[PDB]
Amino acid sequence: TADNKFNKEQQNAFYEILHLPNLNEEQRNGFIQSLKDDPSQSANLLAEAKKLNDAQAPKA
């Protein structure tokens, strides 16, 4: 890149965020929808998403 700053584990994770089998997209599409249509808070979104993962992922 040369203008914005999409690298802090954002781009890479994004492709992954779209795989979490334990969540619906209403919420997911929410954070990321901004990541694609608005590369602004996309980074902070990354953080919040990973969190919303466990909040609904099975466990022991």
Side-chain angles (χ1 to χ4, degrees), residues 20-52:
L20 296 172
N22 22 62
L23 340 164
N24 19 291
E25 233 184 302
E26 214 191 337
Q27 319 299 68
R28 220 198 332 173
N29 180 62
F31 25 106
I32 26 169
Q33 166 164 68
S34 0
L35 175 137
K36 27 269 295 222
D37 301 34
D38 263 73
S40 190
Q41 267 64 302
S42 330
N44 145 51
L45 264 37
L46 227 311
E48 299 237 85
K50 308 290 117 189
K51 234 179 181 242
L52 171 144

